[PDB]
Design an enzyme around this catalytic site. Sequence first.
Site, PDB file in Angstrom:
ATOM      1  N   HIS A 159       1.527  43.884 -25.707  1.00  0.00           N
ATOM      2  CA  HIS A 159       2.326  44.671 -24.777  1.00  0.00           C
ATOM      3  C   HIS A 159       3.131  45.773 -25.448  1.00  0.00           C
ATOM      4  O   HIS A 159       4.079  46.277 -24.836  1.00  0.00           O
ATOM      5  CB  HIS A 159       3.274  43.756 -24.001  1.00  0.00           C
ATOM      6  N   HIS A 160       2.792  46.171 -26.670  1.00  0.00           N
ATOM      7  CA  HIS A 160       3.599  47.147 -27.390  1.00  0.00           C
ATOM      8  C   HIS A 160       2.885  48.461 -27.654  1.00  0.00           C
ATOM      9  O   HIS A 160       3.492  49.523 -27.499  1.00  0.00           O
ATOM     10  CB  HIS A 160       4.080  46.552 -28.715  1.00  0.00           C
ATOM     11  N   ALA A 161       1.616  48.424 -28.052  1.00  0.00           N
ATOM     12  CA  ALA A 161       0.863  49.657 -28.235  1.00  0.00           C
ATOM     13  C   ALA A 161       0.754  50.404 -26.912  1.00  0.00           C
ATOM     14  O   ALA A 161       0.542  49.801 -25.856  1.00  0.00           O
ATOM     15  CB  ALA A 161      -0.528  49.352 -28.789  1.00  0.00           C
TER      16      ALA A 161
END
Lengths: 368, 264, 506, 182, 104
Positions: free
Chosen positions: A134-136
């Site tokens: 859920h970060h890139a």
Amino acid sequence: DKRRVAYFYDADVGNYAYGAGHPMKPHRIRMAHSLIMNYGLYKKMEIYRAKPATKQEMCQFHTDEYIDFLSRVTPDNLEMFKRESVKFNVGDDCPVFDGLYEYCSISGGGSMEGAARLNRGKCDVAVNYAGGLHHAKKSEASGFCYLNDIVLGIIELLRYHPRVLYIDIDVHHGDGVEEAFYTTDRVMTCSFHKYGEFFPGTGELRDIGVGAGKNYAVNVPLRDGIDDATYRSVFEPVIKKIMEWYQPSAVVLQCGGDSLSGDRLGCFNLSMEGHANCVNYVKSFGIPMMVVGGGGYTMRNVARTWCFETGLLNNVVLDKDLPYNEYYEYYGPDYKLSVRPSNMFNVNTPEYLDKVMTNIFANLENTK
Amino acid sequence: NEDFCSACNQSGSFLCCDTCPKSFHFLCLDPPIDPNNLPKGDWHCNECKFKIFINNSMATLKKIESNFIKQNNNVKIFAKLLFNIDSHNPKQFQLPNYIKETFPAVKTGSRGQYSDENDKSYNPDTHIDSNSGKFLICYKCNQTRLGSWSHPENSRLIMTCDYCQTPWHLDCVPRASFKNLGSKWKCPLHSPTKVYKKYKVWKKQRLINKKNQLYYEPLQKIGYQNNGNIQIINQDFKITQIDENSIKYDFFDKIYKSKMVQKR
Amino acid sequence: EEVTFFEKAKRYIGNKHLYTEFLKILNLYSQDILDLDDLVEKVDFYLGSNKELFTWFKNFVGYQEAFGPSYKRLPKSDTFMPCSGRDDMCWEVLNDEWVGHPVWASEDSGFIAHRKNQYEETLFKIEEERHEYDFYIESNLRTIQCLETIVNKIENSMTIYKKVIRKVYDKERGFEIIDALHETAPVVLKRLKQKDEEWRRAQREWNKVWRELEQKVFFKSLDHLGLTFKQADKKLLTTKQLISEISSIKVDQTNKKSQLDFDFPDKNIFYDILCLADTFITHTTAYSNPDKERLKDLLKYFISLFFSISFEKIEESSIFNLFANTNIYIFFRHWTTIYERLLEIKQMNERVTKEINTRSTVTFAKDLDLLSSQLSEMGLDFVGEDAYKQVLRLSRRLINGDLEHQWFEESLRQAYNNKAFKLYTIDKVTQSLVKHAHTLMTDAKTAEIMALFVKDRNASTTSAKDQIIYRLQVRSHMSNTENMFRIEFDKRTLHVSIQYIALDDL
Amino acid sequence: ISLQIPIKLKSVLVDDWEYVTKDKKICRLPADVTVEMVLNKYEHEVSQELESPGSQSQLSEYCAGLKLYFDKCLGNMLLYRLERLQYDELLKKSSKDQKPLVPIRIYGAIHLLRLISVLPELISSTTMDLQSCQLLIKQTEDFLVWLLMHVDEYFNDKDPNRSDDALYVNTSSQYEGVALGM
Amino acid sequence: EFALGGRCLAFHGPLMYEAKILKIWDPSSKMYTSIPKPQKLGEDESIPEEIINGKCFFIHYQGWKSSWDEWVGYDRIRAYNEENIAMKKRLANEAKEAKKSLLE
Ligand SMILES: [Zn+2]
Ligand SMILES: [Zn+2]
Ligand SMILES: [Zn+2]
Ligand SMILES: [Zn+2]
Ligand SMILES: [Zn+2]
């Protein structure tokens, strides 16, 4: 409920390791799988091995240059790859290892297939712990994440559902996912995370969304070491209000082990049942679910957590005694199935939480 | 050779030279060269190029004279500069050491960056002044909320705003954690110093040396349209001495006008 | 009313600098610069502490898109980057204008991590070594199985095998041998099997080592406040700490008699503290021989007088006021601290014992091979032996000095699940209580006030001058500087109230 | 040599440095108000009111030499490291058409403004005389004053988030990374 | 500008010397406030009569030993601002010019 639960697992996900000291090991997926299998749960879910995704599907959200660089970069060919390394943040925080492309393809294929199965109606419960990066965000590796397959899942669900709701419970804010839907009103991102001088740093309380995504993004700022009795109290009313008001057709939940008590990087004081409370409450509404696995760097804890959650979704409560898995040594002195919280002082005062409730509900008062 | 670019004075990618032991960033080079297509040869700085091709100890006068006489009929005030700038290495642009000094509120960071006046278990001692022995009565809550060592779950955290040192509860104003790494925290009892009105933008003037500060006082004392640059008691940054009672008066008839716009 | 609002605001804010900022804000609004909603919010943050003046302002003035703080907006030039799979609906639902890039949200300073104890770090090291061993073994096993399925076919998921071959043939000959295989399978397969055997042997030995190391560390790691405790308590259980607490409470209450309040539901805790105190007093070689009995008598008399529980059963094991100095007040706070600690311990004691006696074991391999027989060999695993009473026994033991604090605290962790961490200073708190009693006896003025309290308590039937003359006499025995503490107790409900009358007696 | 820059121009230069280096914003290019056209407007508006031929021709010489020097020195002494990436991008875009570079037609009103800030530092390291330096300084001062009258139109307050035509534009994380990493 | 512990710049002939304030004199009460403070004039502490009745201050010269502490009133103790720094630099430059004239 008695939901027909499908399940996805590739036997190649435990054979791709990060750097030696890197906190991100997908081996936790593999002993979580063994915890699921030796408990006799394999007779209750539909096990699958989803096809790995291709570049044409990652280019739906990611960029052609980014995907192309991903497919060719290698620890062997790194020294001539210097501009892309800095450009896409593929250096030390998100290192390059031997099977990065394979792992990303596996995670994306699994999550995209899970969304496909949810769409067709084969199962009302699809689970893929391999995904959950859920970060890139579409152009850069971030937070050990390289491919935000979650957005592909919501893309496929939106292909069938008018409204899809995303909930993030990782102590890290769902930056990439909220960014992907900051402007649209089809998707609500709701991230429960630690707010402060923390790695996400985003997820401010006044981040209701811009454009048509205004008032369609929920951020829950939290202080250190929240426990089950307080996490459930801040969790349930907001979920109730969103379901009653936004009323999604589909819904996606990110189940990261980072908020576990005594996580390698986490700082929350959630035990096993405090974490499972959120899963129980989410399954308490009946709409189809696509469970992913995000944070967590204490694999002996996240494996137990994930095994308990997959038991819970099938409406059964697993044994507190281990079924003698292969990696028995990992599970502490008592070899039980639980996470023991620590004695640290929880600083989340009720007044700050009450102000948070007031703000969130006042913002949601305009989302019939 | 050098660990800094000869233009940006920063570390990073270096295209060093051999004729002159200099180190340059690839972007910090005129023209900016792509590292992908390396020159693959002997690279010399602009100063090295001038010193090799042109710098005959006496003939350089001949070259500069020729360049001047090819520009004396044309623009010749810039002819010397136009000639000489061809002998220099590219450099990162910096302010000329005195525009900054015109404002005693700005400072240069480490590599040369902008920096201003806002750059910056159970702990009951945080509620103690320690210089007067007094407690920190928060403005919003009018308490310190020390709790107790026996019962630490009643203490309330305080930040004590970094500008006017006003104590504040983390719960009195919604806040998740203290401000320690980023900018200096400022309590909401301060002027906005920037206004967006519907658009239109307003900004307060910067801090200048009081040598160049031209304070002024009006005479009408009732109606005098001023900016936010007021003082409560090049000729462009005059700070009005507002005569505080004039603030009250100006507020009053302003509310009156806001009433009569909708009243008549 | 409307012509005096400025003075009201000046008196409410109570500062000149904040008044300066408020006046600047009012001017900014007056010069058309500030709008009404910003002014309304500023007044709410200045005079919103009151429900009267702020509402008056609100109805006098007749008040009656929004971007976020963590997202930038790129121009439309940065929008066109061709995505070879982005469908039209993807172009519709996605967002490429607003990005946060947390480094921008982090003020380019950095991120503050979390604090972890050394035990946690050792656990991390063990976990990392385990993960490396298992990852190598699993990769080798997968490649071995693939090579078996190849060799059984040739008798008559694209990088795992190459990686493991290169690791095994680390002499850089792996590059050539991989292609040689692609066109020698049995020999590399058997070498892999041999390496697997050695790796599994080493893994078993290391598993033994890891388990042995962990079994002593794990319980310590989850002890977060416990490790810090027994040290923070020493500076945090001082008289100045309690004075600061009570003064903060009084100061907070003076901006709007019973500043402190305690309740004593349990009774046997008094006898337990008496037993522990007598054990310490007899054990300690620090008082005179009659001084031990003098301390015991003072304790028993004070308990049987203030509470009037029993004057004899202590040896078999109308609201009363009390004006006290700092010494008596701090001794009282010591007693209160011990009582609350033991009350918290005993309140859950039943469920603690229930869980302890229900502690089953896994028999798959735990009881078969490896068991934790360290806290059991000494008897600090609370088999039966109700947690409260075994706790009292081991407290007397540790006071008597036949038990090192290491196993005391390890047992407290393993039995109470780190819930009895505040018991690690019981010996020292009891010693401080004994010292406080010893100071109480040896002071003339404290002795006089103590006798005055005895008289007031045993009288139990006083006149209308009760408080005045008693307070005056306590002050006469006293100087004009040190504070009073009004400790009251009603025998009806076992509730104690403390009033911080610092200098209000004058 | 002393140069008397107006206080408002000094504030504008400080704001530009802060926006480029602190806020990472870069100029919105090509400017609708460019260096060449501001110089042309200055020359036109001053020449029509000036009748003396010598000072009028010297005005034209001053403007032409200013254009030449600005074109020659933008790529050398008038760019921060952050804007070097956008400079290289413009350079390669122009080279893709085999076209030359005309910075006076791209940059405007603020890189020209930053151009006359090191002029005392540029003339000092020359062999040029004193009265010619005095004449050049006077010409720069007059140009500065003329700009000062027409100041409510070259640096206006617009937010990039609220205005696409804002003088500054927000940069991307990838752009910032490539610019400030190499 | 003028407070206990604050910096100050005081005249001394054709040049100034920066110092830090330690005592604040109150001529009305014949008293000075010091820091490690209502207290009369000291037994060894005294101020010149031209500054005993003025707002005098006890200052220590930085770069000078602790034995050069002086009681200077409002006459020479200036307000430490940008003008004070510019004027200190101005008289330092004038001292430099005087030295150069004495030399060249
Ligand atoms: Zn996480
Ligand atoms: Zn450079
Ligand atoms: Zn060179
Ligand atoms: Zn408060
Ligand atoms: Zn403040």
